[PDB]
Structure 1
Amino acid sequence: STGSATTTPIDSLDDAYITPVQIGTPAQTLNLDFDTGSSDLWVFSSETTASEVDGQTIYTPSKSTTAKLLSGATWSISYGDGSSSSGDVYTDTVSVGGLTVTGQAVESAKKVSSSFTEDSTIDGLLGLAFSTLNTVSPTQQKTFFDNAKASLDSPVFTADLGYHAPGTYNFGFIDTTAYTGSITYTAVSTKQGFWEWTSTGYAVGSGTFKSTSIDGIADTGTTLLYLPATVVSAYWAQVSGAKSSSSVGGYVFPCSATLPSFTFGVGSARIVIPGDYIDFGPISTGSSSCFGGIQSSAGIGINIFGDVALKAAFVVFNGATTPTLGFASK
């Protein structure tokens, strides 16, 4: 089997992407944030505290003839951005782009933090990291991909995120029309539960490539590119007037600037992030200070190849017995 679904930016900045997901019978379609940095499929629901729901579409398990309470199971998650959610668990039928999993754990939120409430466009998350990170207790549950894997034509999914445009998540096949040149594959460590890999270096603009190993995670659920302070300083030093602002929470730059590109290495291959992808616009409405899309990972504890990086590439998440990651230009 295979599946193919379009993923759409939630706003004009590409802050996140939502993908329609069918849950239950008859189908209830919710727009979920596919997150290769976590491993829980959780949804706003009829059980979510009423004051914490503001415009989201909810899953109502009592209206699904295939929903079953997973008795005794609870979940609770905290994300890198300080947001969180928790609740109980149902199993139900879940379909993405024509690919159906029966008995998928659907984690129903009883509580969500303010960041989730305030974002009307995201009805929940669909985790695509390794199932060892799943938070369901006392019986850990499998991700949608892990459940689908054996049925797929090939044990892979791909992320093809757009810049200010829709893109695609495919399951079970590689669309050879969706990228240019060849795909370069690189080793993955699953030791921390992430799609963790090592970039071979970077360049700023038309500058020379610096060969240096940068360990990080491929994370579709993180907006920005978070890299070591040395690398980030070298980038922003090429933008007149750019500076790190403790009050704002990272590097800012004059909105009048033209940003240089940023290149990262994948083996001997190179992915170029155009300068425009690094612009996250005014820090507040009407400001002439703009927020940068490359930020320091210092104090996160890990480097993160988030959407800023991934949307410059066609990315293969290869879930074979020994997982790997592939990157192609597009």
Structure 2
Amino acid sequence: STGSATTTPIDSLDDAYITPVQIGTPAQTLNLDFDTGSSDLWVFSSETTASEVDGQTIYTPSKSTTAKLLSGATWSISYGDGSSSSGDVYTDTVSVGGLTVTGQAVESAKKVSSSFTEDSTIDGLLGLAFSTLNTVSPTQQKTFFDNAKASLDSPVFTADLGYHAPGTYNFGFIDTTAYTGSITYTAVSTKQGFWEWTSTGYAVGSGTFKSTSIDGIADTGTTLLYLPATVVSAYWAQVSGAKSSSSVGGYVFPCSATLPSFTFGVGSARIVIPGDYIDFGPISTGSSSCFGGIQSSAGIGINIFGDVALKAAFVVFNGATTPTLGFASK
């Protein structure tokens, strides 16, 4: 079996992507943020504190004939941006683009932090990292991908994110028409629960490629590309007036600049991020300072190949016994 669903940017900056997901019987369609950097499928629900819900569509397990309380199970998760959520757990039928998993753990939010409440278009998250990161206690739960895996034609999912445009998440197959050239596969470490891999280097604009190992995670749930301070300073040094601002929380550049491209290595292959993908617009409306799409990973503890990088490629998340990541130009 296979699944295919369209993913759409939530705003004019590609701050996040939402993908419709059907939950329960009759179906309740929620728009979830597919996140390869977490492993919990959680939703805004009829149990979420009324003052913490602002425009979101909620999951009502009492209206689903297939919902069952996962008795005693609770979840509690904190994300790198400081946001958090917690609640109880149900099992229900979950379908993504025609691919159905019965008995999927659906983590109902009892509490969400302000960052979740204010994103009216995001009804929850669908975790696609390894199930070892799942926060369900005392019985740890499997992701939608993990649960679907045996039924899939191929144990894979692919992320084809668009730049200011919709894209696609495919499950169980590789669409050979969605990319050009070949897909370069690279080793994955599952030791921290992430799609953690090693980039072979980088180039800034038309500059020469520097062969250097950069460990990092392929994370659809992170908007920007976070890399070591050395790499990020070398990129922003090519943009006149660009500087790192402590008041803004990162690198900004004059909105009048035309940004150079950024190339990252995947084995002997190269993925080119056009300069336009690195422009996140004015820091505040009307501002002449624009926010950079490439930021330092210094305060995080891990390098993150977020949407800025992933949207420049057709990306394969190979969940076979020995997991690998595939990258192709598109």
Which interval holds the TM-score relative to the shorter structure? over 0.9
How far off is 1:117 after superposition? 0.3
Runs (4+) of structure 1 exceeding 6 A deviation are: none
How far off is 1:312 after superposition? 0.1
The residue number in structure 1 matching 2:329 is: 329
Q: Any idea what the Cα deviations from partners look like across 1:156-188, whole Å, max 9, x if unmatched?
A: 000000000000000000000000000000000
The residue number in structure 2 matching 1:293 is: 293
How far off is 1:83 after superposition? 0.3
For 1:51, what is the secondary structure of its paired residue?
Answer: helix
In the aligned structure 1, how far is the partner of 2:70 from the partner of 2:55?
Answer: 27
In the aligned structure 2, how far is the partner of 1:119 from the partner of 1:300?
Answer: 23
For 1:104, what is the secondary structure of its paired residue?
Answer: strand
How far off is 1:206 after superposition? 0.0
How far off is 1:299 after superposition? 1.5
In the aligned structure 1, how far is the partner of 2:251 from the partner of 2:299?
Answer: 15
How far off is 1:54 after superposition? 0.2
In the aligned structure 1, how far is the partner of 2:185 from the partner of 2:173?
Answer: 15
In the aligned structure 2, how far is the partner of 1:329 from the partner of 1:281?
Answer: 25
In the aligned structure 2, how far is the partner of 1:156 from the partner of 1:248?
Answer: 39
For 1:198, what is the secondary structure of its paired residue?
Answer: strand
User: Pairwise mapping of residues 76-115 of structure 1 onto structure 2 (< 5 A)?
Assistant: 76-115=76-115
Give RMSD over aligned pairs: 0.2
Q: TM-score, normalised by structure 2?
A: 1.00
In the aligned structure 2, how far is the partner of 1:112 from the partner of 1:25?
Answer: 25
Q: Any idea what the Cα deviations from partners look like across 1:170-217, whole Å, max 9, x if unmatched?
A: 000000000000000000000000000000000000000000000000
Q: Any idea what the Cα deviations from partners look like across 1:222-280, whole Å, max 9, x if unmatched?
A: 00000000000000000000000001000000000000000000000000000000000
How far off is 1:327 after superposition? 0.1
The residue number in structure 2 matching 1:180 is: 180
In the aligned structure 2, how far is the partner of 1:229 from the partner of 1:247?
Answer: 18
In the aligned structure 2, how far is the partner of 1:70 from the partner of 1:39?
Answer: 17
The residue number in structure 1 matching 2:58 is: 58
In the aligned structure 2, how far is the partner of 1:81 from the partner of 1:274?
Answer: 26
In the aligned structure 2, how far is the partner of 1:94 from the partner of 1:229?
Answer: 41
The residue number in structure 2 matching 1:137 is: 137
Q: Any idea what the Cα deviations from partners look like across 1:31-60, whole Å, max 9, x if unmatched?
A: 000000000000000000000000000000
For 2:315, what is the secondary structure of its paired residue?
Answer: strand
For 1:308, what is the secondary structure of its paired residue?
Answer: helix
For 2:164, what is the secondary structure of its paired residue?
Answer: coil
The residue number in structure 1 matching 2:38 is: 38
How far off is 1:293 after superposition? 0.2
Identity %: 100
User: Pairwise mapping of residues 126-165 of structure 1 onto structure 2 (< 5 A)?
Assistant: 126-165=126-165
How far off is 1:133 after superposition? 0.1
The residue number in structure 1 matching 2:231 is: 231
How far off is 1:132 after superposition? 0.1
Structure 1 residues not aligned, in runs of 5+? none
